[PDB]
Write a protein that binds this DNA or RNA. Structure first.
Length: 1077
RNA sequence: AUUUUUGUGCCCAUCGUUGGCACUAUUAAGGAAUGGAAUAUAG
DNA sequence: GCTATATTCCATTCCTTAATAGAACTAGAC
DNA sequence: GTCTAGTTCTATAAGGCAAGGCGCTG
């Protein structure tokens, strides 16, 4: 029920004397250079593992003694690594030779794993182990003795101990406790418990431990049996009894005996090493004298990839075995028939090169409907010619042959509308062998080919060394500390300096590479965020209390916007533009402390100092653990719906509600509390712009720029295109340009759209790429209305960045060609560095735009939950669980559109953020039917689904809308469950407006519009509702949307609400019962 | 231990009135997608 | 009606999963 | 009295498929 997370603060290193920063850098260089030594050594230790080393263990979970050995003996690593490479063919032979037996299925699957042949190769770690023995002159029996002890101590194997512990037991020369003493003592405790198994009091239990230890006190007991180290749980019982905090605690004799029996194995030996002195000597030669902190720090970096990749690879092998078990090899013959397409005459290749077949190549399970249509044509064609005795009807069948093509051609094109277009030739070939293979078998065969290729291509994880980071702290690490604010105050008072500053100091014990001795030194850091939320001190007496959350942030209740003195204001106006932003923040900081507005921050040695040295740059990070206690007594449920182009929404439901609006949900009283859209507003001149929806200024205020763009297009407005045998069409892009140049259009849409048109222009003028160069810089870079200068967090702004990157791609590709060595970033940078920089600037800008959107959306969701929690109580935030949206069976455009969703990225941020607050919990839920369920009716107790609707005026009606509505009236059946809702909803539209299909069907759009206008005018309404997939509105039984208007739909009264607001309620209601007893 | 000029970023035809905001860091691989140039296909 | 399938070669993005960011202690050194 | 620099510590159920959850713009 205890949760732990870390909050990190990045900082800037504020340098000191070159010589002072040189000493720190030299130390950092020392740990980094040494780290690869431990990695090579531990890999070698892994090679020494054998059956006599892992005989009778827990072997983690669902693992095989063989797999544990194979992962240690053989690893996939870079080709240029020191360990000798081995061919995958010899893996089984080497395993048998070392093992003395053949490898099992798990070991075999491991060897079978895919990897990049060009970048990595298998390495024989066993051979590396021999190198250690030969190089260090070690007895095989002696190293084996040490290896066995290391395994018991968790220095090697599946579950590893901390680097600090491993270094201490392996290389420590400090006084160690006597294991024999603990072993007799633990056995005696077990013995008395067996002798008196019915005790049910801690008091009886504490007496037994003391009897076992032959002592009257825990202190005396600890001195004899566990002289040094943390207190064991058994002794902890005696201790807590003396302080009387465990008197009423439940006693379980079997468990105490069982836990004690498990810990017995570790005390059968005294840890007397035989090769540690030699090994320490080799290490000393390569990394210098043994120190616990330095050796431990290097080992931690070395051990992480070795231990982590072993865990990941074992899970991977087990998953792969299961995936292979899932494949139906019994369907392999059917796959052969389907795969026979390449050898048929329906597929033609110059080099006869085939490719993998997937379900989307036949339209997945739709081929079943198509087969039926084909059979009806065939059965009708048989009867026709059976009762068409007259000969010379070759055309009858020839006509039937043509009908088959059109049936397939229609099928492919129809499936192609909402998905990838299936292959006509493949389908024609399959119909030829219709007698040969059943249709269901075809799907099964095509699925087997696709599934087997996917599982077979999965790659193993290579073992790659880490780029090291070193940690300084109060305990179990390199000694380090952040000077405390009180210490800071004292320091400045003793130096006769101003009481407060904006710099942070740390004192860390560092090694002098020259003297090879430890020294403590001070280093200065700078991090306004750390100062504001932690470090700056509340000097005033009677300062506000520390917040429930430690950090002093706006979300935590500290507004931090105090009245500024005129002297402070001058400093901001006075400061250079580069420093104005930081100074204003500091001035407010000094203002809130001066005005006693700064809340206190409780200080503890809770901050870790992480230092990373890249070149001469030092990256110091301060991170602290944040503890939280789970609270499962939720009173409010906050649902979150995530959208790509529309606004995200949230809805809160009160639980165990009693009041005017209470609804009884399956015996649970709930009250919809509120719903809303997630928007991030930024103020400008008493004007606020939502960062998630702003699409840019209208063109009329951008007339020079739009006209400036027009002048360039005019020079290259001559573009040729060929469609439907339309070669040398002499297409004009400027016509298309004006369509987007309307003053009513948003700038971002214009800029994104202009990029595409420019993209097409370059395609026509392939040898005139160079000319667009300067226009691109003004469009994306230098221009005042350039993409880099103005952009929002809206979906359209992101697409604009997408098109801009593609456009640069086109300019580079066209810039180089035949009139073959391949173009690389090196060539493009050489050919055009400025443009190359522009691509990087756009990439870096988009990544910073994406990080922000995730953080700002996360804060709004967390802020609402915190607001609801204070008024009502513990809140459970629920978000849709979105996964596997990008698939190869979907159109690339659909996949490209889906990539910008960011739902998982936002949820991970919310999930991480929720961990810092008590009374807040986050879980993901199934999003199935969340857009079509009538909230608070559906599942109370009946199933209630309704279609999404669009609203517009008769002039706004489009042919697409007209077609959509009719399709819904089709009697053709569908696998999509939601299809029923649209047909049912489409029925209401005819019923509600007194129409008949004949009026909608076979009617010009214009005439259809007139019909709809005459009805609306009679009813005194200007807008009409129609069911549209992805519709903006939902007819809800309840008034979930505050701006909803009641309407009578087909004899029923519903509230027209934003569909997204409805969805947020639906998300909250998914498995709502499980959340409450 | 004193640097006094900066933690990282986000928004805007008006870049400031004290403009308005937000935020866990790192390592490494893997999975699934995308862009551009082109080739082969069937229209 | 932006033709679609597939492939090659150069680049990208969004996300997941293995890790790091130790706790409690005391003999002996200030 | 504190603090450092080393040691040892741990604590031990629920559907199958696959659609659903997303947007366009002329």
């Amino acid at each position: 029920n205890a949760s732990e997370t870390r909050k990190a603060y990045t900082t800037k290193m504020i340098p000191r004397s070159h010589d002072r920063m040189k000493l720190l850098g030299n130390f950092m260089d020392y740990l980094m250079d040494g780290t690869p030594i431990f990695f090579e050594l531990w890999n070698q230790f892994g090679g020494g593992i054998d059956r006599d080393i892992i005989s009778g263990t827990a072997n983690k979970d669902k693992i095989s003694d063989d797999l544990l050995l194979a992962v240690n003996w053989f690893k996939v690593m870079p080709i240029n690594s020191k360990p000798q490479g081995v061919s995958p063919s010899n893996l089984a032979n080497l395993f048998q030779q070392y093992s003395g037996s053949e490898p099992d299925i798990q070991a075999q699957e491991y060897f079978a794993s895919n990897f990049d042949t060009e970048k990595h190769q298998w390495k024989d770690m066993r051979v590396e182990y021999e190198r250690l023995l030969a190089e260090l002159q070690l007895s095989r029996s002696d190293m084996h003795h040490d290896l066995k002890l290391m395994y018991k101590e968790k220095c090697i194997g599946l579950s590893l101990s901390t680097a600090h512990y491993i270094t201490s037991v392996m290389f420590g020369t400090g006084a160690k406790n006597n294991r024999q003493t603990k072993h007799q003592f633990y056995s005696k405790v077990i013995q008395l418990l067996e002798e008196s198994t019915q005790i049910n009091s801690v008091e009886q239990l504490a007496s037994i431990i003391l009897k076992a230890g032959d002592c009257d006190s825990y202190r005396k007991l600890r001195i004899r049996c566990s002289r040094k180290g943390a207190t064991p749980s058994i002794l902890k019982i005696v201790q807590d009894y003396e302080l009387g905090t465990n008197h009423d605690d439940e006693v379980n004799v079997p468990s105490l005996i069982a836990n004690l029996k498990e810990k017995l194995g570790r005390f059968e030996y005294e840890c007397e090493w035989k090769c540690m002195e030699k090994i320490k000597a080799f290490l000393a030669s390569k990394v210098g004298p043994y120190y616990l902190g330095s050796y431990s720090a290097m080992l931690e970096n070395a051990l992480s990839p070795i231990k982590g990749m072993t865990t990941k690879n074992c899970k991977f092998v087990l998953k792969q075995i299961d995936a292979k078990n899932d494949i139906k090899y019994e369907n392999e013959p059917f796959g052969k028939i389907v795969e026979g397409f390449f050898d048929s005459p329906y597929f033609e290749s110059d080099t006869n090169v085939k490719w993998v077949l997937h379900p989307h190549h036949i339209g997945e399970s739709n081929i079943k409907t198509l087969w039926e249509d084909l059979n009806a044509i065939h059965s009708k064609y048989e009867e026709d010619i059976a009762s068409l005795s007259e000969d010379k009807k070759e055309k009858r069948i020839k006509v039937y042959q043509g009908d088959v093509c059109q049936t397939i051609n229609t099928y492919c094109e129809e499936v192609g509308k909402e998905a990838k277009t299936p292959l006509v030739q493949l389908l024609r070939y399959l119909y030829s062998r219709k007698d040969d293979i059943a249709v269901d078998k075809i799907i099964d065969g095509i699925t087997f080919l696709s599934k087997k290729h996917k599982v077979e291509k999965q790659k193993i994880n290579p073992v790659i060394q880490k780029y090291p980071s070193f940690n300084f702290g109060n305990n179990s690490k390199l000694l380090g500390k952040i000077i405390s604010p009180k210490d800071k105050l004292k320091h400045n008072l003793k130096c006769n300096r101003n009481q407060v500053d904006n710099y942070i100091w740390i004192e860390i014990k560092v090694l002098n590479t020259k003297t090879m001795r430890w020294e403590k030194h001070h280093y200065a850091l700078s991090s306004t965020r750390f100062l504001e939320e932690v470090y700056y001190p509340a000097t005033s007496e009677n300062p506000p209390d520390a917040l429930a959350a430690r950090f002093r942030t706006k979300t935590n209740g500290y507004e931090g916007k105090p009245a500024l003195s005129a002297e402070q204001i001058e400093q901001i106006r006075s400061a250079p533009v580069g420093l104005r932003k930081v100074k204003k923040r500091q001035m407010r900081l000094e203002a809130a402390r001066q005005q006693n507005l700064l809340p206190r921050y409780t200080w503890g040695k809770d901050f870790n100092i992480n230092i990373c040295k890249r070149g001469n740059n030092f990256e110091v990070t301060l991170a602290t653990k944040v503890k939280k206690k789970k609270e499962k007594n939720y009173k409010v449920v906050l649902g979150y719906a995530a959208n790509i182009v529309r606004k995200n929404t949230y809805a809160a439901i009160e639980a165990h509600a009693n009041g005017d609006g209470v609804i009884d949900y399956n015996d649970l009283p709930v009250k919809p509390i509120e719903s809303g859209f997630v928007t991030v507003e930024s103020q400008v001149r008493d004007k606020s712009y939502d960062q998630l929806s702003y699409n840019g200024v209208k063109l009329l205020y951008c007339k020079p720029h739009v006209e400036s763009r027009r002048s360039f297009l005019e020079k290259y407005r001559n573009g040729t295109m060929k469609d439907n045998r339309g070669n040398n069409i002499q297409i004009d892009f400027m016509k298309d340009f004006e369509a987007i140049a309307d003053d009513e259009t948003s700038l971002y849409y214009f800029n994104m759209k202009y990029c595409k048109l420019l993209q097409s222009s370059i395609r026509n003028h392939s040898s005139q790429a160079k000319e667009y160069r300067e226009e691109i810089f003004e469009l994306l870079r230098d221009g005042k209305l350039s993409v880099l200068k103005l952009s929002s967090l809206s979906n359209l702004s992101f697409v604009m960045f997408k098109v801009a990157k593609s456009l640069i791609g086109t300019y580079f590709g066209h810039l180089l060609k035949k009139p073959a060595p391949p173009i690389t970033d090196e060539d493009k940078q050489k050919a055009d560095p400025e443009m190359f920089a522009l691509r990087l600037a756009l990439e870096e800008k988009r990544l910073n735009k994406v990080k922000s959107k995730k953080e700002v959306i996360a804060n709004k969701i967390v802020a609402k939950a915190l607001e609801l929690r204070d008024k009502y109580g513990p809140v459970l935030i629920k978000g849709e669980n979105i996964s596997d949206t990008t698939k190869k069976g979907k159109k690339s455009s659909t996949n490209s559109f889906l990539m910008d969703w960011l739902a998982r990225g936002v949820a991970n941020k919310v999930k991480e953020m929720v961990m810092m607050h008590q009374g807040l919990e986050f879980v993901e839920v199934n999003p199935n039917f969340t857009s079509h369920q009538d909230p608070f009716v559906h599942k109370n107790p009946e199933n209630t689904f309704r279609a999404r609707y669009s609203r517009c005026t008769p002039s706004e009606l489009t042919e697409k809308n007209r077609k959509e509505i009719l399709s819904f009236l089709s009697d053709k059946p569908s696998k999509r469950p939601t299809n029923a809702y649209y047909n049912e909803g489409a029925m209401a539209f005819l019923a509600t407006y007194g129409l008949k299909k004949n009026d909608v069907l076979g009617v010009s759009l214009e005439k259809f519009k007139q019909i709809m206008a005459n009805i609306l005018h009679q009813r005194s309404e200007d807008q009409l509702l129609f069911p549209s997939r992805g519709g903006m509105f939902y007819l809800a039984t309840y008034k979930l949307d505050a701006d909803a208007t009641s309407v009578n739909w087909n004899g029923k009264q519903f509230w027209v609400c934003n569909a997204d607001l409805v969805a947020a309620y639906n998300v909250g209601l998914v498995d709502i019962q499980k959340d409450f007893k």
